[PDB]
Design a protein around this ligand. Structure first.
Ligand SMILES: Cn1cc(Cl)c(C(=O)NC2CCCC2)n1
Length: 480
C-alpha cells in the first residue's frame, strides 16, 4: 500500500509512502498508518492532524473545504497532508482502492428495505453456499463467514469486506440501511445485485433523493418485491429489474423477468411454495414460517436466478435452507403440536408472529410469553391485548423478571386483557412452556415468544441457564 498508488486516479504527483492501515480515528492512528481527516457531525478531524503526526502516521488525507484546493499537496513535520474536496463522498472509493477492491473480488448482494433484510441476507448466503460458494453476511446481527458471524463508516465497510475476501469468501450478502446509503457508506461498492424487500409534496422529494442516489451507485441486477407499493414504483422505471410477487402483482405485458408464487400451502412444519418464473416453474418446500418469509425466500431465489445460478440446483437445495435462529423457528415432532420459538418481545412483533403462526395452524393457536422486569412497563398490557386477540389461548409467564416481583409483571400484562380470566397464568417459564406443549392438540400451534435464540432467564441478579429452544426440543423429543 503506497500513498502514490492509492491517490493515482485523483492526485497525479502524490509522494511515495508505505502505508499500514487506514483510519478516521486519530486516537488509534499508529505509526505507518494513513489518517483521514473528515468533517461531519459538528466534528472536524483536521483538528487532530498534529496529534496524528505526533503519533507517527506515514501520511494524511484531509478535507479541503476552506483550508485548501482539491488535490493540494502540503507537508507538515515531514508528513504528507493531501487535501480532497468532498472527501465524505469519496471515502468509500478511497477505502475501496486502499483495500484492493473487495466487491470486485466476490459476488456482493445488497438487500435494502425496512423488514426482511437479515432473513433475506442469510438465505442468500445459505443458498449460494449450498451451490458451492463460500458465503458471508454483513448485517445488524454482525459480519463474518456463514456460521462465524460476530457483532460504522465507509472505510469500515470496505475494510470488513476485504477481511471476508481474505478469509476466502466468494459471496457476501449485505444489509444496506437507508441511513448508510444517504451517508455514502457503500457509494463505491460494486453490487452484483440489489434487492428491495419493502417500505413501511413530501413523497416527491423522498423519491427524488432515492432515485438520485440509485443513479450514483453500481446496483447491478435489481430484484424487487412487486407486492410493495414503492416496489412497483421502482419497477415502473426499471425495465431490466426482476419483479417478485406472491399476491398477483406481476404485470406480464411488460415482458420483463419475473417470479411469482402461484399457490402457497402453509402447513405444520413450513410452507409448500408453487411458483412460476421466466426461468421456469417449480415447487419449493420451505422450512420457514409466515407469509413475510415466503416473500424473503422468493426474493433470494429470484436474485440467485438473475445472477445465473441454475433453477434445478436451487430447487435441489431449497429444503436445506434454515430460519434465522429463534426467528419463527419451527419445532415439529411426529404426533405432537407444532412449536414456534420467536424472539418477539414487543406488541408489534408479537402480533406479526401470531399472524404468521396462524397460517400454519389448523387447530388452536397458543401464545406463551412474558415481559421483562425492571424495564418500561408500558408494553405489558399492549402485549396482553395482542395475545388475547390474535391467539386462542394466552399462557402468561415469566421472561427475565430481574428484581421486580414476577407476579406484578403478569398482573400488568393481564390488565391489558378484556377477559384476563380466560388467560392461563403459570410462573416458571419452563413449566408454562411445558404446560402449553403438553396440553396442546396435535394440529395446534404453540408460539413461545420473547427469547428466541437467548439462552438465559435473569431471575434476581442471577443469569440462570435456560433456553426456550432446548425446553421445547426435549418435550418434543428432538434436538435443538
Ligand atoms: C443507491 N442505491 C444503492 C442500492 Cl443497493 C439501491 C437500492 O435501493 N436498490 C433497490 C431499489 C432499486 C433496485 C433495488 N439504491
Amino acid at each position: 500500500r503506497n500513498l502514490r498508488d492509492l491517490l493515482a486516479p485523483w492526485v497525479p504527483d502524490a509522494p511515495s509512502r508505505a502505508l499500514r492501515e487506514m483510519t478516521l480515528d486519530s486516537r488509534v492512528a499508529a505509526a505507518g498508518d494513513l489518517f483521514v481527516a473528515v468533517v461531519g457531525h459538528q466534528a472536524d478531524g483536521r483538528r487532530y492532524i498534529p496529534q496524528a503526526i505526533a503519533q507517527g502516521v506515514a501520511a494524511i488525507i484531509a478535507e479541503a473545504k476552506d483550508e485548501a484546493t482539491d488535490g493540494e499537496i502540503r507537508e507538515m513535520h515531514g508528513v504528507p497532508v493531501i487535501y480532497l474536496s468532498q472527501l465524505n463522498e469519496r471515502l468509500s472509493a478511497l477505502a475501496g482502492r486502499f483495500y484492493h477492491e473487495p466487491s470486485d473480488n466476490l459476488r456482493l448482494v445488497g438487500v435494502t428495505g425496512t423488514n426482511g433484510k437479515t432473513t433475506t441476507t442469510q438465505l442468500l448466503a445459505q443458498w449460494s453456499q449450498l451451490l458451492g460458494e463460500i458465503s458471508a453476511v454483513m448485517g445488524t446481527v454482525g459480519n463474518g463467514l456463514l456460521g462465524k458471524v460476530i457483532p460504522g463508516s465507509a472505510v469500515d465497510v470496505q475494510h470488513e469486506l476485504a477481511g471476508l475476501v481474505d478469509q476466502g469468501a466468494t459471496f457476501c450478502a449485505m444489509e444496506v440501511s437507508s441511513h448508510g446509503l444517504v451517508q455514502h457508506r457503500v457509494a463505491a461498492l460494486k453490487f452484483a445485485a440489489s434487492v428491495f424487500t419493502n417500505l413501511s409534496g413530501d413523497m416527491e422529494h423522498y423519491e427524488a433523493a432515492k432515485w438520485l442516489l440509485y443513479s450514483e451507485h453500481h446496483c447491478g441486477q435489481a430484484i424487487i418485491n412487486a407486492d410493495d407499493e414503492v416496489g412497483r414504483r421502482w419497477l415502473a422505471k426499471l425495465p431490466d429489474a426482476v419483479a417478485v410477487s406472491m399476491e398477483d402483482h406481476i404485470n406480464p405485458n411488460c415482458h420483463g423477468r419475473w417470479l411469482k408464487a402461484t399457490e402457497v400451502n402453509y402447513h405444520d412444519s413450513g410452507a409448500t411454495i408453487r411458483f412460476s418464473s421466466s426461468w421456469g416453474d417449480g415447487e419449493i418446500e420451505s422450512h420457514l414460517m409466515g407469509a413475510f418469509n415466503v416473500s424473503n425466500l422468493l426474493l433470494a431465489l429470484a436474485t440467485l436466478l438473475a445472477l445465473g445460478y441454475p433453477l434445478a440446483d436451487l430447487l435441489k437445495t431449497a429444503a436445506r435452507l434454515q430460519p434465522v435462529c429463534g426467528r419463527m423457528e419451527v419445532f415439529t415432532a411426529p404426533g405432537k403440536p407444532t412449536v414456534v420459538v420467536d424472539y418477539a418481545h414487543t406488541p408489534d412483533a408479537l402480533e406479526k408472529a401470531l399472524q404468521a403462526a396462524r397460517l400454519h395452524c389448523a387447530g388452536k393457536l397458543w401464545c406463551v410469553f412474558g415481559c421483562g422486569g425492571d424495564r418500561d412497563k408500558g408494553k405489558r398490557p399492549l402485549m396482553g391485548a395482542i395475545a388475547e386477540e390474535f391467539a386462542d389461548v394466552a399462557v402468561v409467564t415469566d421472561d427475565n423478571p430481574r428484581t421486580e416481583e414476577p407476579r406484578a409483571i403478569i398482573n400488568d400484562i393481564l390488565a391489558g386483557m378484556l377477559d384476563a380470566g380466560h388467560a392461563k397464568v403459570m410462573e416458571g417459564r419452563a413449566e408454562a412452556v411445558t404446560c402449553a406443549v403438553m396440553q396442546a392438540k396435535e394440529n395446534d400451534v404453540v408460539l413461545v415468544a420473547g427469547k428466541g435464540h437467548e439462552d438465559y432467564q435473569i431471575v434476581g441478579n442471577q443469569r440462570l441457564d435456560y433456553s426456550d429452544r432446548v425446553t421445547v426440543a426435549r418435550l418434543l423429543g428432538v434436538i435443538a
